[PDB]
């Protein structure tokens with residue numbers, strides 16, 4: 001049941017960049033998005049195997065109000081693109097879509113362990129996934145990549161602009177008091193204020209969103225099982 | 229264990245105002261809030277000791293329809309900020325959050341015995357807790373602070389604008405006929421009409437909302453036990 005490379009999927013960097021520039025026009029930035037603490041919120045993450053050209057994706061759906069897990073699914077796929085910085089999403093999108101499709105319920109708001117508009121072409125994983133699914137998505141990353149930012153306030157909740165050159169592409173958000181911030185960016189159909197609100201609601205106990213913690217653990221386990 | 233002052237909690241009035249000026253912009257005013265009589269509603273209140281620099285917070289969750297108590301939690305903490313009018317919330321927020329975190333269920337709607345937008349800087353306890361938790365909140369106060377208002381009608385349910393200069397920051401609400409009014413203000417993710425509707429729902433017999441009566445009694449008992 002391995003997810004194969006989609007028929008006609010980009011095979012060159014020129015084609016991939018062309019897809020990004022074309023699909024970016026479908027991104028919605030002025031829709032505030034759903035509020036935190038209600039409905040469903042889903043984490044997505046992937047694990048790449050080092051021995052075979054396979055990638056495993058996991059989607060974990062949480063009840064936003066309680067943060068309890070209500071559903072989960074994984075998918076195994078063929079890596080669909082060579083390793084090229086700036087086009088990394090082309091390696092895993094097909095498999096991520098498969099994991100989401102395997103869920104027994106809608107994901108609600110999708111939280112990716114990565115970036116959305118905070119990308120060289122303003123079309124990272126979260127934005128790419130958002131436009132293809134038509135669903136609200138955001139990205140929360142552990143490191144700032146090559147972006148810059150002023151240290152946000154020390155208290156949890158504090159934020160600061162995350163910049164690509166001089167342009168704001170997200171926010172450094174303090175999820176835990178006095179602890180290193182995470183980097184939040186909009187993906188699709190969610191604004192920055194709401195992206196931050198969801199990230200804080202997913203981090204009452206840890207620095208990393210529970211959606212990422214859950215999805216990370218699950219795809220790693222599924223990858224181990226797939227290679228066994 | 230005693231809730232200590234957060235790793236990066238404000239230490240100066242300048243830092244405190246910085247937090248307020250940053251989070252105030254994230255307060256939500258265009259949402260109606262949960263329908264009264266549905267789900268759960270939570271009261272929060274604190275008790276300060278005169279001899280020891282400690283504050284005790286209590287969170288009591290009620291069934292919105294019946295007003296029956298369904299959950300309770302308390303927390304004892306170090307006063308996290310010196311006494312400075314306009315920044316009083318910085319002394320108790322960490323402890324209040326600890327109490328909320330210890331609850332076995334989502335709060336639903338947080339009703340504070342204090343103020344929300346009706347604050348000398350438009351960011352009182354209710355609004356601050358709202359932005360930090362992402363939850364809907366309102367403030368219900370026993371006195372009008374320094375705000376002006378005309379006596380509301382005599383019958384229960386009667387209301388009148390609570391003004392800060394010329395701007396409405398809440399409403400003087402008659403919760404009981406022949407009894408002085410209380411002062412309701414939006415905290416976060418709730419509108420004034422709903423804040424008042426919830427306040428009337430919480431006052432079928434007494435002047436003070438049952439959420440406050442419950443939380444007040446609980447933090448007071450917890451404080452006595454803590455300093456015993």
Ligand SMILES: OCCC(CCO)C(CO)(CO)CO
Nearest residue numbers: 065066204328329331333334
């Ligand atoms: O509902 C699960 C999370 C809650 C903790 C229990 O009320 C929380 C309370 O403010 C949010 O509703 C965050 O600690």
Ligand SMILES: [Cl-]
Nearest residue numbers: 086087088089
């Ligand atoms: Cl990329």
Ligand SMILES: [Mg+2]
Nearest residue numbers: 045046113216
């Ligand atoms: Mg990962």
Ligand SMILES: [Mg+2]
Nearest residue numbers: 045046113216
């Ligand atoms: Mg991972």
Ligand SMILES: [Mg+2]
Nearest residue numbers: 273274341444
């Ligand atoms: Mg009180």
Ligand SMILES: [Mg+2]
Nearest residue numbers: 273274341444
């Ligand atoms: Mg009291």
